[PDB]
Amino acid sequence: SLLEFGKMILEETGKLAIPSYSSYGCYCGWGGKGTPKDATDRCCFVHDCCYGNLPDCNPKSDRYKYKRVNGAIVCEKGTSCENRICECDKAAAICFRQNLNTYSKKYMLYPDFLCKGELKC
Numbered sequence: 001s002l003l004e005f006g007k008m009i010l011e012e013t014g015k016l017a018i019p020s021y022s023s024y025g026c027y028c029g030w031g032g033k034g035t036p037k038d039a040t041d042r043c044c045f046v047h048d049c050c051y052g053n054l055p056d057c058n059p060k061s062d063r064y065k066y067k068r069v070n071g072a073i074v075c076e077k078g079t080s081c082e083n084r085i086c087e088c089d090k091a092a093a094i095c096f097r098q099n100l101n102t103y104s105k106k107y108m109l110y111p112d113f114l115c116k117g118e119l120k121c
């Protein structure tokens with residue numbers, strides 16, 4: 001759920017998912033249109049796609065458990081949905097951490113009309 005995801009992000013990047021990741025570019029946060037603006041936005045695109053592979057799960061509200069073995073994220077065993085949701089989130093958190101160097105404040109609160117294009121998962 002958003003509770004685990006938000007905490008994962010904070011731990012990984014040091015940034016508060018809200019508002020650092022919840023209104024960035026074309027895919028980070030409400031939204032799903034156009035060409036991703038940068039690496040961080042691509043992380044959110046892939047994340048969106050990952051959740052898209054789970055039509056009968058509920059990623060925003062289904063809670064999972066995860067632990068950290070030193071710095072590594074390890075998804076704990078739960079229902080099939082919880083395991084798969086956790087893997088989606090873990091990947092996004094790592095992706096965000098891998099692209100912190102290019103994270104740009106100019107993409108925060110990015111206006112909708114500038115999100116143009118088609119990009120299939």
Ligand SMILES: CN1c2ccccc2[C@]23C[C@H]4[C@H]([C@@H]5C[C@H](O)N4[C@@H](C5)[C@H]12)[C@H]3O
Binds near residue numbers: 032049051055
């Ligand atoms: C296609 N679509 C869906 C079709 C059928 C079930 C679920 C989904 C979506 C809605 C949502 C979300 C991501 C994000 C995304 O932008 N949308 C996609 C993938 C999904 C994902 O959970």
